[PDB]
Amino acid sequence: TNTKGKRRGTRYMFSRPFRKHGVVPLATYMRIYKKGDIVDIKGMGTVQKGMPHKCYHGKTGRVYNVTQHAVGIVVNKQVKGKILAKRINVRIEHIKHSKSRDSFLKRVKENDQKKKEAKEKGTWVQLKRQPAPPREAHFVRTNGKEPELLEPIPYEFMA
Amino acid sequence: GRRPARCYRYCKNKPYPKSRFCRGVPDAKIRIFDLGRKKAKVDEFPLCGHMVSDEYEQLSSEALEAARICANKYMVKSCGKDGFHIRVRLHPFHVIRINKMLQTGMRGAFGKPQGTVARVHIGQVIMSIRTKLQNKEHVVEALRRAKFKFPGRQKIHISKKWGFTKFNADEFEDMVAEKRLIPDGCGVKYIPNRGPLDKWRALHS
Amino acid sequence: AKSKNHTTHNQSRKWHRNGIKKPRSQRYESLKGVDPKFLRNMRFAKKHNKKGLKKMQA
Amino acid sequence: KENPMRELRIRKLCLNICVGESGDRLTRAAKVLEQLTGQTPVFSKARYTVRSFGIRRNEKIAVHCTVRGAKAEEILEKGLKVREYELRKNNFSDTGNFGFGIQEHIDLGIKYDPSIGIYGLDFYVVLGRPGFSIADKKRRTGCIGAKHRISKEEAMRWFQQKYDGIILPG
Amino acid sequence: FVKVVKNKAYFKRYQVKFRRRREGKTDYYARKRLVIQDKNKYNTPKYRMIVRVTNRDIICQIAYARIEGDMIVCAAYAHELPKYGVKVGLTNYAAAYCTGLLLARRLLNRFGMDKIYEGQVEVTGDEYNVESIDGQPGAFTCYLDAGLARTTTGNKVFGALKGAVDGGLSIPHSTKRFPGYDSESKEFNAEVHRKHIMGQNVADYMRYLMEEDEDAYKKQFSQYIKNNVTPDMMEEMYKKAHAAIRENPVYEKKPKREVKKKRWNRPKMSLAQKKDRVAQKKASFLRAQERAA
RNA sequence: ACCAGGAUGGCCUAGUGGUUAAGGCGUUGGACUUAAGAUCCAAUGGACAUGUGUCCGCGUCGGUUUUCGAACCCCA
RNA sequence: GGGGCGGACUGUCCAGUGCGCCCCGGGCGGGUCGCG
RNA sequence: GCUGGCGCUCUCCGCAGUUUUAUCCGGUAAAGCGAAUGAUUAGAGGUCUUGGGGCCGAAACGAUCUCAACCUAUUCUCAAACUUUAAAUGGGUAAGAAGCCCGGCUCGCUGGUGUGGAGCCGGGCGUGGAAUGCGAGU
RNA sequence: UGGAGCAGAAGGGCAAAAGCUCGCUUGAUCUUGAUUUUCAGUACGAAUACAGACCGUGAAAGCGGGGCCUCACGAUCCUU
RNA sequence: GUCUACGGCCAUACCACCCUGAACGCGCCCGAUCUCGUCUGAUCUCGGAAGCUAAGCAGGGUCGGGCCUGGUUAGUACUUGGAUGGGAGACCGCCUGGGAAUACCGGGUGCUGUAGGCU
């Protein structure tokens, strides 16, 4: 059997990237985390305090509590056949703001900005994003040149 | 003494080199990987022939020495004592194990290091010989004789390259002439158009 | 008499028979684990929201 | 014309007496360095134990001092008056420093007393131009630059044009 | 010979430090503990009194750190002390006090807190700390940024600190680093600190030199004679400077004018030019052989 | 094979906690005796079995080698 | 591509390379609009 | 945990062993060793940075050759307990009414600041804001 | 650029440091709750953010409730 | 055109050598009475302004090394899913989608925020 150690198998996971060791850049610490904000967990190995467990690395959660140097996050964690909503405490170094929700915020701002105008102009805009449609019927111009003829190559033993 | 090579023909295990975790490994039977005129220049031995593997198999160090003795003997007989250069292009790094049983059974059945065996892929060169152009049938018969020391199927392929180099034999001589390859012992050194200009002045003085 | 040591073989089927349900998120989630100083001040704010009730109706 | 700041100057004269064993025989060498330099020197400890030398770790086996100002100039003229203004070409280092050794400190002109004895010592001269302290400052430390460094062949020229010294070959 | 250390693999594996650390201008260990706010304070600015001694100038800045960079709220230099009267000695302890006081009064006048929070109007040099008056806005609170300056007793960063806290800024400090604090008795002497604030350590040096070596006095205080500053006027000259600072601490911008767009550096050389240059070098080197033979 | 050990002057044995190389016999030189043993006065020598790690420093502690001896190898 | 003015810069033969403003000769490339 | 039974609360918005659009996560396959660590084959080019020697000298980096290490560029072959790179498959999150947008109170937390945060109230906005499928919850 | 050291196994981490040398110390103290880890989502152990004291240290920002992290340990009954 | 003070991103910024640097600045530089700390005013700390861009620093240069970004490598290697595909096997081919990495060959060589100067 294995060991139940806390950092078992985290040799590359908690390690720093190549030529990215040493001083933590200080705008990591300057980012505002509100209640309810959606963030991504990624354990930095420079700071050994507040370190999330390896099952939270690469998980995304919702911040429920904010303290001086750390936040509490609600994280979905699958425990065999049930998913638990975790209440974990993790420092500011091991988290980063998720960008998955701030494109939905861009979509709702351009969707309420397309509801509130064009209503006075009477036309109808689209808000539900359709998937990638079949390609429309189009003409392909071969102006002058004939399409180049391809043949399979003879087999030559390379080396 | 040692088992027949059919026990360790296939690359079944993960690679297992000798390191600080594998100790008590006996030295390989093959030690010398180059025979013939090692000191021959790059323009003296233009014609290169390879013995190329066709299987993902494992060649023993004993076989790698037997084939180089067979090929060496035919090339010293046919091309004369120094008219060739043989490079064995596999070095046996994968250690094979043995669980010797004279009783414990399969309890604690992790082997002690039995021997050293090289791993070859489909299309990887096993042996290479460079020589003069007129010794081509002697190269082909030398590798064809050395074939029988090896398990599995090997092809003999006269390479497009110039000896033991990465450059083609047709483009080789005029790109030596244009001072793109400077001959440096066995092979060549490529001179790109990218260094400081003092190297270009030293080359074009 | 040796035996099988460990497996996770039929487990993914058993987890999916009644489903792998996401945990039940409802609005107004509980305040367990929030900062006690912040929560004590929040309870003072909730205790005195009735104070400025006339300004609200005005 | 060269600038006034390319003029070579003696940064420091570093004197040590390496006795090799601790006690009274090292305190009298400290008194030698005191009467030579005008200041109390500091002892240096052995880094590890070598039985062939008779040293133990962290045992005070040498004493040394650094002098600057005009006092380094005066003690260096003392040292070269002992050495008769002759240095060998190999006494100059690759970075533009030089040095020598005195077999007897009372040859410098320190009066002998029975309470101390006679100690040989070791002279090292570190030269510099103005601006060599930027590698030692705290706020904006840098390297001194290639055209500002002292070559061996420049420190030899400074020595021969500053003390009329004769650089012995070999 | 020697295995060369700065080979190709060395620069492949080299991780350069931060630009400010490589230059030497920033202690990032200090900056992490100094500029970062607690995260349950939520864009509440954390203010700094950056105090920087150059060779000819003391700089006192009030800043707060943002993600996109530090945001300077107020700034005061010593080169503007000729406006208030301190013509000579723009990098002494008294000038440090003057620009700390000028930074404090400029910032409080910008925030509207000039008539409140006046500090010590008479400088006596002891421990003083402003306090928040109820009903009025609370006092401005910042923390000192000495940078890499070795905070020993008598450092001019603490002169700037004393100028700021006598102007009315709430900065946490002790009197252990003010000049006049005796290290052996562990007591602080406000009168000695008042002499250092009013420059009665340097007028003592001019009186010291005018009796020992008049020529060394000439070469040590040369612009003092040119500006006609004597040992006897130093206290009231700094007093009039402090009174003028609290009279008018607002800063007027030096007006922008037009210039003829003159470039003083070499422009970066183009790809066509750097190909042509090496082609010309090759042609010249080859002609220096086909003309030699 | 598994466990437990053991390798030091020419032979037989000491030797730690980590700094001291020990003893007996032997060898060598001089006395005693006509001479030799015995006896008396002295002297030398150690691949500390190897390399590695710990430590300032190892014969000494800790893992791996190379020669040896001891115990066990049972129920059918 | 050519012309004009302003400059910068380079080559171990006067010779050459960009950049700024203006003009011409256009060829070209597809987009947008109009006409048949 | 899987199972059955008994139900119950609603339905007649929600959810998914699925994709898409976004967005993070990873160090396996492959690849690399003219890149760190480790292993390792071959020549070549150099000098004193040392040594082993022939030969010329008391000898001399004085002349003279080599041969070794050493250094500089190449080259052959590699790694589960190496790695600059680095997949495919895969794991989180988001795809709205519990959402946005105004106004106004409370706070003993925060503190230049009707500052910041948080909690309360009042109002406004339904094109239900990817595809597909299915009644769910307890 | 760490090829050293950080008590040790190994891995990760670390350069005006987390290493080395000084200065001062005792946050290796008292007291609730919450959380992570193994997990049944139980304990122990270990750990993490907080809060309430009382302190240390520094000029201050801050940092500290043991050791840079991953290991170094113990229920009921009884005794003290 | 550029610098100073504080920075964010942390080499397109580093490294080696060379050339230029107007004005302010940054510095080097002068000194040790005071503050302070050293064997040593070299550092640190303080008090200054005779001299100078020599150094740092800034801007350029190198058929520069590194770094960054492309092409090639290469639809190669590998890979999701499929077959009563092949082969004694080893392994390989096809269908279905996904898809690298060196060597080799191009291009680039710090942007930028706040406050305050100089032309």
Ligand SMILES: [Mg+2]
């Ligand atoms: Mg196997």
Ligand SMILES: [Mg+2]
């Ligand atoms: Mg079982």
Ligand SMILES: [Mg+2]
């Ligand atoms: Mg500090």
Ligand SMILES: [Mg+2]
């Ligand atoms: Mg792994």
Ligand SMILES: [Mg+2]
């Ligand atoms: Mg592989």
Ligand SMILES: [Mg+2]
């Ligand atoms: Mg506390």
Ligand SMILES: [Mg+2]
């Ligand atoms: Mg510690």
Ligand SMILES: [Mg+2]
């Ligand atoms: Mg019991």
Ligand SMILES: [Mg+2]
């Ligand atoms: Mg000085």
Ligand SMILES: [Mg+2]
């Ligand atoms: Mg300069």
Ligand SMILES: [Mg+2]
């Ligand atoms: Mg210059």
Ligand SMILES: [Mg+2]
């Ligand atoms: Mg380049």
Ligand SMILES: [Mg+2]
């Ligand atoms: Mg700017």
